[PDB]
Amino acid sequence: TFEVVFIVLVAGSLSLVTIIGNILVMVSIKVNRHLQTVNNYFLFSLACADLIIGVFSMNLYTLYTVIGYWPLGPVVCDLWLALDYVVSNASVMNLLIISFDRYFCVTKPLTYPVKRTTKMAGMMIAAAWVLSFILWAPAILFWQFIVGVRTVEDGECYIQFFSNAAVTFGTAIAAFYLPVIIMTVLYWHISRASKSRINIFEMLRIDEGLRLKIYKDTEGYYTIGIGHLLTKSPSLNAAKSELDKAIGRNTNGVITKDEAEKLFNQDVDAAVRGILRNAKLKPVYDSLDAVRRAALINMVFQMGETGVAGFTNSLRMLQQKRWDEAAVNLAKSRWYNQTPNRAKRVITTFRTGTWDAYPPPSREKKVTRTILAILLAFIITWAPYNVMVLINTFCAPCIPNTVWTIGYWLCYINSTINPACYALCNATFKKTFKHLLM
């Protein structure tokens, strides 16, 4: 009524925070090499979708609600709805992709992580957007022509086939409920698998540590990341050569926390490959389980496959599934005497077949930390609206208009609190933002 200016300021500010927030994320990733990871590519996609929501959906919806009707016409109305639903679907599918990524990472620690590249990412993102569009856009814009008549009037804006509540609910289930269910199930599996969370990566970063700067090994050779051997030369540049060959970029000698893990997975994959092509090592590797297979890989990491091959006697004891004796036998090596601590854990891993010899990081991954917040925010903000649809199926009068409006703004602001989560669950994003404002 007379209080219009207030609403406009609030909604305007909110839309402003959203747009500058996501653009800040997209830029933060583009301009900072440290933030350039496949996980952040997903967040980049999310930021795009959320940006569009801030510029278009929020603003136009505000206009539609403050003015009491739709002044902009049918064509712009149809584009607006398409855009909204297309990007919303893109968002939920991105959440799905992230979920599948976590599942494979957790379930296939050795094989999967190595094949996670920027290319696969961009393609999965591409499929997400394209597929979403294909589903919503055509139906939303052309439904009128399909049926031959337009049910939507000149002052109102809504999806035409949604005129029937049953169809709207059905669509909610397929578009929102099912993906949520699926995300629940596979995250249930992810939970089961990670209850006592240690993986070959955590293990090797404990034993060999994780250095982002070239450090001379006890043997005297050049090394990087998680015990990655470079060269034997006394000239640093001789190492910088091999390093820049593995990175594909001029590092000057220093790499990021992400390039370290990309190199790590490369070593792991290569490790396994060689073990399988190795006649002494293959049989025992075939017989061992995931945890004990990791322990073996650890040994190959430290002393090399030619060294590990020298443990034929103990290896045969492993294949016989005699764990305690295999341990006793392993401790008789000088390897045990020259690297007591690490050896004890690896041997113990062989002994028990569990990760119980290794202490958890005590601080969860940035990726898992972020993912959780994203999901919480998504479900808490979208559930109200969707359960509103459910209830609307049997009782329309129960849900007033003011309620629908609230539901809409919840779904909308979820695009606002995303960059907030990145900054809170990831110190690098926050830092980058801070420096980006200046």
Ligand X SMILES: O=C(O[C@H]1CN2CCC1CC2)C(O)(c1ccccc1)c1ccccc1
Phi-psi region of 321 (alpha: psi -120 to 50; beta: other; left: phi over 0): left
* Stretch of 46-54, 227-235, 346-354, 401-409 lying at the interface with ligand BGC (CB under 6 A): 227-235
Is 227 one of the binding residues for ligand BGC (CB under 6 A)? yes
Measure the CA angle with vertex 366, ends 362 and 368; round to 5°: 85
Residues numbered 353-382 forming contacts with ligand X, rule: CB under 6 A: 382
95 binds, among ligand X, ligand BGC, Cl ion, none (CB under 5 to 8 A by kind): none
Query: Which H/E stretch holds residue 356?
Result: none
Q: Using CB under 6 A, count the residues that bind ligand X.
A: 16
Nearer to ligand BGC, 169 or 301 (CB): 301
C-beta of 229 vs 238, nearer to ligand BGC: 229
Options 229, 247, 383, 436; binder of ligand BGC; rule CB under 6 A: 229
With b for 16 or more beta-carbon neighbours within 10 A and e for fewer, the 95-117 pattern comes to bbbbbebbbbbbbebbebbbebe
Does 129 sit near ligand X (CB under 6 A)?
no
Structure tokens at 213: 């700067």
Question: Residue with the closest Cβ to ligand BGC?
Answer: 271
| Joined tokens for residue 110 | 């050795």
Q: Determine contact, residues 137/86, Cβ cutoff 8 Å.
A: yes
Q: Which does 366 bind (CB under 5 to 8 A by kind): ligand X, Cl ion, ligand BGC, none?
A: Cl ion
Q: Which of 154, 156, 217, 364 is catalytic?
A: 217
Beta bridge partners of 225: 211
- Please compute Rg for the chain using Cα positions: 27
Point out which span in 66-74, 168-176, 180-188, 310-318 binds ligand X (CB under 6 A). 168-176
Q: Flag whether 57 is marked binding.
A: no
Please identify which residue in the block is written with the tokens 């393609």.
123
- Is 65 a binder of ligand X (CB under 6 A)? no
**Interface with ligand X includes 409 (CB under 6 A)?**
no
Q: Which does 118 bind (CB under 5 to 8 A by kind): ligand X, Cl ion, ligand BGC, none?
A: Cl ion
- Residue 386 contact partner, candidates Cl ion, ligand BGC, ligand X, none, CB within 5 to 8 A by sort of partner: ligand X
C-alpha 180/C-alpha 175 separation (Å) is: 9
Among positions 151, 171, 348, 368, the unique one binding ligand X when judged by CB under 6 A: 171
Question: Which position has the token pair 């907030």?
Answer: 420
Distance in angstroms (rounded) separating the CA atoms of residues 49 and 89: 10
Rounded to whole angstroms, what are the CA distances from 191 to 100, 103, 185, 187?
Answer: 13, 10, 10, 6
Contact segment (CB under 6 A) with ligand BGC among 2-10, 95-103, 225-233, 279-287 equals 225-233
Task: State the Cα–Cα distance between residues 28 and 23, nearest whole angstrom.
Answer: 8
DSSP 3-state percent helix, strand, coil across the chain (nearest 5): 75, 5, 25
| Residue 186, both tokens | 């596979």
Confirm whether residue 100 is marked as ligand binding: no
Q: By CB under 6 A, what part of segment 279-308 binds ligand BGC?
A: 300-301
Q: Residue type at 435?
A: H
> Which position among 33, 67, 115, 118 is part of the footprint of Cl ion (CB under 5 A)?
118
Which strands form 211-216's sheet, in the order they lie side by side?
211-216, 222-225, 228-229
Is 217 a residue of the active site? yes
Closest to Cl ion by CB, 154 or 364: 364
Q: For residue 219, indicate whether it is catalytic.
A: no
Catalytically active residues, by annotation? 208, 217
Can you give the binding site for ligand X, defined by CB under 6 A? 84-85, 88-89, 92, 168, 171-172, 175-176, 382, 385-386, 389, 408, 411
Known binding residues for substrate: 229, 301, 314, 329
Can you give the binding site for ligand BGC, defined by CB under 6 A? 227-229, 267, 270-271, 274, 300-301
